[PDB]
Design an enzyme around this catalytic site. Structure first.
Site, PDB file in Angstrom:
ATOM      1  N   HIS A  61      45.829   5.856 -24.308  1.00 23.60           N
ATOM      2  CA  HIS A  61      46.827   6.854 -23.936  1.00 23.60           C
ATOM      3  C   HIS A  61      47.720   7.253 -25.100  1.00 23.60           C
ATOM      4  O   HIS A  61      48.497   8.206 -24.965  1.00 23.60           O
ATOM      5  CB  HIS A  61      47.727   6.316 -22.816  1.00 23.60           C
ATOM      6  CG  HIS A  61      48.432   5.044 -23.165  1.00 23.60           C
ATOM      7  ND1 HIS A  61      49.710   5.021 -23.685  1.00 23.60           N
ATOM      8  CD2 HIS A  61      48.041   3.750 -23.071  1.00 23.60           C
ATOM      9  CE1 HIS A  61      50.078   3.767 -23.888  1.00 23.60           C
ATOM     10  NE2 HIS A  61      49.079   2.978 -23.531  1.00 23.60           N
ATOM     11  N   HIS A  93      55.409   9.900 -28.464  1.00 20.05           N
ATOM     12  CA  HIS A  93      54.962  10.602 -27.272  1.00 20.05           C
ATOM     13  C   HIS A  93      54.952  12.091 -27.575  1.00 20.05           C
ATOM     14  O   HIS A  93      55.742  12.570 -28.392  1.00 20.05           O
ATOM     15  CB  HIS A  93      55.881  10.359 -26.076  1.00 20.05           C
ATOM     16  CG  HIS A  93      56.035   8.917 -25.736  1.00 20.05           C
ATOM     17  ND1 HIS A  93      55.372   8.321 -24.683  1.00 20.05           N
ATOM     18  CD2 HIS A  93      56.739   7.939 -26.346  1.00 20.05           C
ATOM     19  CE1 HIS A  93      55.686   7.034 -24.647  1.00 20.05           C
ATOM     20  NE2 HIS A  93      56.511   6.779 -25.647  1.00 20.05           N
ATOM     21  N   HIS A 116      59.415   6.467 -31.054  1.00 17.97           N
ATOM     22  CA  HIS A 116      60.002   5.236 -30.537  1.00 17.97           C
ATOM     23  C   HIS A 116      59.772   4.111 -31.534  1.00 17.97           C
ATOM     24  O   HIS A 116      58.625   3.838 -31.910  1.00 17.97           O
ATOM     25  CB  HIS A 116      59.403   4.862 -29.177  1.00 17.97           C
ATOM     26  CG  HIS A 116      59.829   5.774 -28.072  1.00 17.97           C
ATOM     27  ND1 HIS A 116      59.162   5.870 -26.862  1.00 17.97           N
ATOM     28  CD2 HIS A 116      60.873   6.640 -28.011  1.00 17.97           C
ATOM     29  CE1 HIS A 116      59.804   6.751 -26.101  1.00 17.97           C
ATOM     30  NE2 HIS A 116      60.832   7.233 -26.776  1.00 17.97           N
TER      31      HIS A 116
HETATM   32  N1  LIG Z   1      59.278   2.545 -26.399  1.00 20.11           N
HETATM   33  S1  LIG Z   1      58.531   2.523 -24.873  1.00 20.11           S
HETATM   34  O1  LIG Z   1      57.554   3.845 -24.629  1.00 20.11           O
HETATM   35  O2  LIG Z   1      59.494   2.346 -23.581  1.00 20.11           O
HETATM   36  C1  LIG Z   1      57.476   1.038 -24.891  1.00 20.11           C
HETATM   37  C2  LIG Z   1      57.639   0.091 -25.890  1.00 20.11           C
HETATM   38  C3  LIG Z   1      56.831  -1.033 -25.885  1.00 20.11           C
HETATM   39  C4  LIG Z   1      55.887  -1.189 -24.886  1.00 20.11           C
HETATM   40  C5  LIG Z   1      55.739  -0.215 -23.883  1.00 20.11           C
HETATM   41  N2  LIG Z   1      54.751  -0.313 -22.769  1.00 20.11           N
HETATM   42  C6  LIG Z   1      53.419  -0.828 -22.934  1.00 20.11           C
HETATM   43  O3  LIG Z   1      53.040  -1.210 -23.969  1.00 20.11           O
HETATM   44  N3  LIG Z   1      52.556  -0.863 -21.755  1.00 20.11           N
HETATM   45  C7  LIG Z   1      51.154  -1.378 -21.843  1.00 20.11           C
HETATM   46  C8  LIG Z   1      51.136  -2.882 -21.908  1.00 20.11           C
HETATM   47  N4  LIG Z   1      50.917  -3.331 -23.288  1.00 20.11           N
HETATM   48  C9  LIG Z   1      51.311  -4.729 -23.428  1.00 20.11           C
HETATM   49  C10 LIG Z   1      52.811  -4.785 -23.642  1.00 20.11           C
HETATM   50  C11 LIG Z   1      53.346  -4.517 -24.948  1.00 20.11           C
HETATM   51  C12 LIG Z   1      54.724  -4.559 -25.138  1.00 20.11           C
HETATM   52  C13 LIG Z   1      55.555  -4.861 -24.053  1.00 20.11           C
HETATM   53 BR1  LIG Z   1      57.474  -4.915 -24.286  1.00 20.11          BR
HETATM   54  C14 LIG Z   1      55.029  -5.126 -22.760  1.00 20.11           C
HETATM   55  C15 LIG Z   1      53.647  -5.084 -22.571  1.00 20.11           C
HETATM   56  O4  LIG Z   1      53.122  -5.342 -21.316  1.00 20.11           O
HETATM   57  C16 LIG Z   1      56.529   0.894 -23.887  1.00 20.11           C
HETATM   58 ZN   LIG Z   2      57.428   5.021 -26.141  1.00 20.02          ZN
END
Ligand SMILES: NS(=O)(=O)c1cccc(NC(=O)NCCNCc2ccc(Br)cc2O)c1
Ligand SMILES: [Zn+2]
Length: 257
Positions: A61, A93, A116
């Site tokens: 993604h 994004h 980000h």
């Molecule tokens: N700056 S943000 O767009 O809000 C942002 C920043 C970091 C991570 C994510 N979300 C994902 O990575 N979702 C997919 C799962 N990947 C594993 C995983 C990795 C890091 C973390 Br913490 C939790 C996790 O489960 C979104």
């Molecule tokens: Zn992000």
């Protein structure tokens, strides 16, 4: 199986991740007449070591640039924080066309993309895995990217994409300091929020920069030419990956300026 398509996308995420309807969800629209200036906010301080840059990865993604996070070579301090936060990743994004693509909006205005830069609380926790679900676990800098002149600071990132075109591909990405991507001024807004995609943990203190950075239409096209499919399958471009803004639910966005 979550994504950004009509069947698995943001509006359906709550079926698998009920926190999607939570009280600290991100991104948000920052209404500047409702922000509260906070004189206690200190300046943002970033000090990143380019030797911590590790790898660039196509995650289907999106794509991620990950950093070695075994020590405090690369840290964020100041702002609303009293702990030091350790850099671990940056990513972007974007949207289907130039008219949208950012996650945060300011006074309803949508930008073309958003950077980000993510960090985890190494003062309190021992690893990203421990910190990821803690209310004070994560700190993410968001920079709005306004379509306009080509941004040369993006060059190394863009040049790397040809080696990670399809889902799961990864390559070394070394000797890079992502503070070079930040705007000249670090005046910011801050609010308590969440990861903007599953698992949507409400663990992020957001730092949204007031000043945008530029990106050209053709640079955005390079993002959208990344492929969400695995090698050999029918090519499926990554057209967009921005979540709609979510209700503030009584939260206050503070301003450093
Ligand atoms: N700056 S943000 O767009 O809000 C942002 C920043 C970091 C991570 C994510 N979300 C994902 O990575 N979702 C997919 C799962 N990947 C594993 C995983 C990795 C890091 C973390 Br913490 C939790 C996790 O489960 C979104
Ligand atoms: Zn992000």
């Amino acid at each position: 199986d979550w994504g950004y398509d009509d069947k698995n996308g943001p509006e359906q995420w709550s079926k698998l991740y009920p926190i999607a309807n939570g009280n600290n969800q991100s991104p948000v629209d920052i209404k500047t007449s409702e922000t509260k200036h906070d004189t206690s906010l200190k300046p943002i301080s970033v000090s990143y070591n380019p030797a911590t840059a590790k790898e660039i990865i196509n995650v289907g993604h999106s794509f991620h640039v990950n950093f070695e996070d075994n020590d405090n070579r690369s840290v964020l301090k100041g702002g609303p924080f009293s702990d030091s936060y350790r850099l671990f990743q940056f990513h972007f994004h974007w949207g289907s066309t130039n008219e949208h693509g950012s996650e945060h909006t300011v006074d309803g205005v949508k930008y073309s993309a958003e950077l980000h830069v993510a960090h985890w609380n190494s003062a309190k926790y021992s690893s990203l895995a421990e910190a990821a679900s803690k209310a004070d676990g994560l700190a993410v800098i968001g920079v709005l990217m306004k379509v306009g002149e080509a941004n040369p600071k993006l060059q190394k990132v863009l040049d790397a994409l040809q080696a990670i075109k399809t889902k799961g591909k990864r390559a070394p990405f070394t000797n890079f300091d992502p503070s070079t991507l930040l705007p000249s001024s670090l005046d910011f807004w801050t609010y308590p929020g969440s990861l903007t995609h599953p698992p949507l943990y409400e663990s992020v203190t957001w730092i949204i920069c007031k000043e945008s950075i530029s990106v050209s239409s053709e640079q955005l096209a390079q993002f959208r030419s990344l492929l969400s499919n695995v090698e050999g399958d029918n090519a499926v471009p990554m057209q967009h990956n921005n979540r709609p803004t979510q209700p503030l639910k009584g939260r206050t966005v503070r301003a450093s300026f």
